[PDB]
Design a binder for this molecule. Structure first.
Ligand SMILES: CN(C(=O)[C@H](Cc1cnc[nH]1)NC(=O)OCc1ccccc1)[C@@H](Cc1ccccc1)C(=O)N[C@@H](Cc1ccc(O)cc1)C(=O)NO
Ligand SMILES: [Ca+2]
Ligand SMILES: [Zn+2]
Lengths: 324, 308
């Protein structure tokens, strides 16, 4: 029942030029400084959305490459920013960036592999860093990083699979750890994981597919679990998961497209989490990526698994088979 | 308001700068705990600073007395609780509490379970807190039966029940652990959930859980007299609700699923009729419903072809 009501003067056209301008000018501010702890991911969101729009050249490649090198630590892991601590989240983001730029050997790939390998636990799970937080988010970060480097064989894959499957729930979904409640974010991480490791036959696609399509509210937007407000990014996790399991047609594509377009800021460019709210690069990427999965002509095809242009993944020959 | 943001920034930035400088210097001391407390209060997702607190507490543990270290730990628990009250959905804060409790000589787990209960009173859907409660339950060896009673009180006292029904789905198998619930348990659960959705027909969580219970059986040709009678009773009760709430899609779907559970071929006519009504009522799901109907029509052909 909880939903937004889209006012009738909400944007109903795609404003690609404004979005490119918004991202091109981002970080030229209070919010920028307070999100330094996730800077590497911020850079990934910006570059990926620009590349999906055909505008990657407007970003500063050489500056970003030097920044990434300076964020790899002696253990091989990559931090969010210079001086911060290494983590799987920012290691993935860094590898995705270097893959976009065909510059993987800017960092020490052997040490990245060793870092990822070192974070796997006896039950097959992965910690995010040396402090031991366990979450299926990190199982996905681990295999997505290794897949992009061609080094999936470096971890214990069967045990990693066993752990992820132990996180599958009564409703067909997945949570962060065994016993955790289903959540769209975690479902994206786990279905992406199972795509990468060739285990999608173990998902109950009809059951999970149903739970996912029930995320769509009368406004057209998707929420991330029952009784929550829709958000343009939960919209993305849900759509990518549905695509991975071959069930994207189970949501009303036109109603969702209209909800995503209504989240644009016509004055500044960018997308917000919901109509009328303040935009940010995170929601700009996931709004544009959502539109691409729904088949928007002006945007490059996007990988539902890696949230990167398909043409990039074709180049490195890392293209997981989906359900359909 | 605007000028004060520049006031906060510079204090945030200078404190941040000061912490990093101290860290390279190897000054693992209380000044760092002071600086990080300022920053982590406003910004608990700054993970590197939680790492810094742990490095300082680890270092101070070595060069302080048991009583001084006990004091530091109690101060840490208070700091964590104050951070949680401000932002109860931060991964970093909940993880630091787990890290802290896991290394204590004599942790008070009962106090932690009470913290969870209080946070679940404020937001019954906070998955960070449910996850923490499972951690505490495991560490304290709390039995599935006790946690089952907790979920019951939570389900009847108010709504927002998806998280509580989920916890039940994980606890029930543990009370009856197999290498697919026993029928006596299933029948009690069906009764509990049926009450739930006739109390609030708009509560989607009871309907999702009920669909799982309808699958957790032993087959339609293995239907006992009691289970057959219970499912037929649910069927008529759903039809009752359907007259009261003609736009309620959950009841229509559940009618279809019940007829499937009872006798696919005998109810084929009615099943198809209900798909037409449901698609009219829930048009966004029409594609899903067509694929489900196609799957059921395919199962029916296989059942008809099994005829001797
Ligand atoms: C850490 N994080 C979040 O907690 C966001 C917060 C939010 C989103 N919309 C409104 N607020 N939540 C979030 O990303 O939920 C996604 C998710 C949860 C669990 C598993 C996977 C994804 C966001 C950043 C953010 C902070 C504050 C406000 C908005 C965005 C974030 O970094 N998300 C990660 C999610 C992720 C992480 C790991 C993976 O393996 C896959 C995905 C991301 O997209 N990385 O590239
Ligand atoms: Ca450039
Ligand atoms: Zn969001």
């Amino acid at each position: 029942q909880k939903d937004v009501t889209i006012k009738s003067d909400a944007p109903d056209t795609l404003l690609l030029e404004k979005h490119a301008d918004y991202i091109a000018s981002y970080g030229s501010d209070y919010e920028y400084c307070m999100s330094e702890y996730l800077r590497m991911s911020g850079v990934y969101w910006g570059l990926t959305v620009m590349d999906l729009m055909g505008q990657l050249h407007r970003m500063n490649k050489e500056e970003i490459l030097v920044f990434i090198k300076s964020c790899q630590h002696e253990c091989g892991g990559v931090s969010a920013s210079i001086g911060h601590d290494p983590h799987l989240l920012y290691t993935l983001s860094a590898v995705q960036i270097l893959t976009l730029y065909d510059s993987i050997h800017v960092i020490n790939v052997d040490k990245v592999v060793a870092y990822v390998q070192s974070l796997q636990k006896e039950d097959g799970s992965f910690a995010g860093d040396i402090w031991g937080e366990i979450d299926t988010r990190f199982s996905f970060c681990a295999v997505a990083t290794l897949a992009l480097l061609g080094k999936l064989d470096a971890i214990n894959v069967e045990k990693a699979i066993e752990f992820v499957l132990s996180c599958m729930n009564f409703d067909g979904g997945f949570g962060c750890r065994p016993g955790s409640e289903s959540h769209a974010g975690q479902i994206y991480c786990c279905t992406g994981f199972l795509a990468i490791t060739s285990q999608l036959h173990q998902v109950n696609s009809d059951l999970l597919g149903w739970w996912l399509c029930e995320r769509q509210l009368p406004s057209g937007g998707l929420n991330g679990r029952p009784e929550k407000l829709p958000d343009v990014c939960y919209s993305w996790w849900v759509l990518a998961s549905l695509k991975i399991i071959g069930r994207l047609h189970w949501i009303d594509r036109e109603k969702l497209r209209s909800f995503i377009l209504a989240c644009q800021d016509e004055e500044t460019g960018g997308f917000a989490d919901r109509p009328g709210d303040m935009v940010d690069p995170f929601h700009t990427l996931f709004g544009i990526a959502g539109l691409s999965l729904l088949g928007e002509e002006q945007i490059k095809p996007v990988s539902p698994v890696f949230c990167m242009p398909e043409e990039v993944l074709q180049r490195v020959n890392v293209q997981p088979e989906l359900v359909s | 308001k605007r000028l004060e943001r520049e006031q906060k920034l510079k204090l945030y930035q200078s404190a941040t700068q000061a912490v990093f400088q101290k860290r390279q210097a190897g000054e693992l001391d209380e000044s760092v705990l002071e600086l990080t407390s300022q920053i982590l209060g406003a910004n608990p997702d700054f993970a590197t600073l939680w790492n810094c607190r742990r490095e300082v507490l680890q270092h101070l543990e070595t060069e302080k007395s048991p009583e001084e270290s006990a004091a530091l730990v109690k101060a840490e628990l208070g700091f964590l609780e104050s951070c949680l009250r401000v932002n109860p959905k931060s991964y970093g804060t909940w993880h630091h509490r787990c890290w802290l409790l896991s290394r204590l000589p004599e942790p008070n787990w009962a106090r932690e379970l009470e913290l969870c209960a209080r946070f679940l009173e404020a937001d019954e859907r906070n998955f960070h807190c449910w996850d923490y409660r499972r951690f505490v339950a495991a560490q304290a060896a709390v039995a599935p039966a006790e946690e089952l009673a907790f979920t019951d009180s939570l389900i009847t006292r108010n709504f927002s029940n998806y998280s509580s029904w989920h916890y039940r789905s994980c606890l029930l198998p543990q009370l009856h652990p197999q290498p697919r619930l026993p029928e006596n348990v299933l029948l009690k659960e069906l009764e509990l959930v049926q009450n739930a959705f006739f109390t609030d027909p708009n509560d989607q969580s009871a309907w999702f859980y009920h669909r799982w219970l309808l699958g957790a059986g032993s087959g339609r040709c293995e239907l006992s007299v009691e289970k057959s009678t219970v499912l037929q009773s649910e069927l008529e009760s759903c039809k009752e609700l359907q007259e009261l709430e003609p736009e309620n899609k959950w009841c229509l779907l559940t009618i279809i699923l019940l007829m499937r559970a009872l006798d696919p071929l005998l109810y084929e006519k009615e099943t198809l009729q209900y798909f037409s009504t449901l698609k009219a009522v829930d048009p966004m799901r029409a594609a899903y419903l067509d694929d489900l109907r196609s799957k059921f029509l395919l199962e029916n052909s296989v059942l008809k072809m099994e005829y001797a």
